[PDB]
Amino acid sequence: RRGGVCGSVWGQNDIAYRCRTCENDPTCAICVPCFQNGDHNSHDYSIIYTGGGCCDCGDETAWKPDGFCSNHK
Amino acid sequence: RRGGVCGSVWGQNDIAYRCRTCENDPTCAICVPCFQNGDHNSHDYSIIYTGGGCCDCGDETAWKPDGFCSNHK
Numbered sequence: 001r002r003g004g005v006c007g008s009v010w011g012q013n014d015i016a017y018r019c020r021t022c023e024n025d026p027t028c029a030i031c032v033p034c035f036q037n038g039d040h041n042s043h044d045y046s047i048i049y050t051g052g053g054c055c056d057c058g059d060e061t062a063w064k065p066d067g068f069c070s071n072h073k
Numbered sequence: 074r075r076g077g078v079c080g081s082v083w084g085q086n087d088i089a090y091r092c093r094t095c096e097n098d099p100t101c102a103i104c105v106p107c108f109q110n111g112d113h114n115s116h117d118y119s120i121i122y123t124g125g126g127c128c129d130c131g132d133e134t135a136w137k138p139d140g141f142c143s144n145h146k
């Protein structure tokens with residue numbers, strides 16, 4: 001739609017998605033909802049325990065824009 | 074990303090941002106970089122001369138967490 005960074009926050013043992021195809025570096029990650037509302041088919045992704053932090057969806061400095069979800073473009 | 078308080082220090086006449094929507098009390102403030110890397114759209118913020126002190130971004134005791142920047146969550 002017309003018109004944001006996700007910024008959703010993880011606690012120590014919250015899971016997220018690592019996508020090695022979309023990440024700017026090895027510490028980037030996106031929340032499960034942003035992963036499920038994007039397109040990572042044939043990407044090299046894995047479920048991870050975050051150790052805390054925040055989702056990088058929407059942040060071009062941390063995540064490749066073709067990897068953004070429908071809500072953070 | 075995965076993984077802090079900002080703690081950046083101001084001198085007497087250094088500017089920072091007051092955000093009345095995010096602050097825990099009237100003496101809190103965040104540095105310009107933390108302001109620019111957060112989301113305060115439609116918040117009641119102002120540029121101020123600090124009189125010294127330190128940025129509250131990342132410190133839940135001084136600043137509402139939805140007001141933190143991308144680097145201090």
Ligand SMILES: [Zn+2]
Binds near residue numbers: 007031055057
């Ligand atoms: Zn997200």
Ligand SMILES: [Zn+2]
Binds near residue numbers: 006
């Ligand atoms: Zn997203």
Ligand SMILES: [Zn+2]
Binds near residue numbers: 039044067
């Ligand atoms: Zn991907």
Ligand SMILES: [Zn+2]
Binds near residue numbers: 129
């Ligand atoms: Zn700061």
Ligand SMILES: [Zn+2]
Binds near residue numbers: 079131142144145
């Ligand atoms: Zn910050």
Ligand SMILES: [Zn+2]
Binds near residue numbers: 094112113117118140
């Ligand atoms: Zn604010």
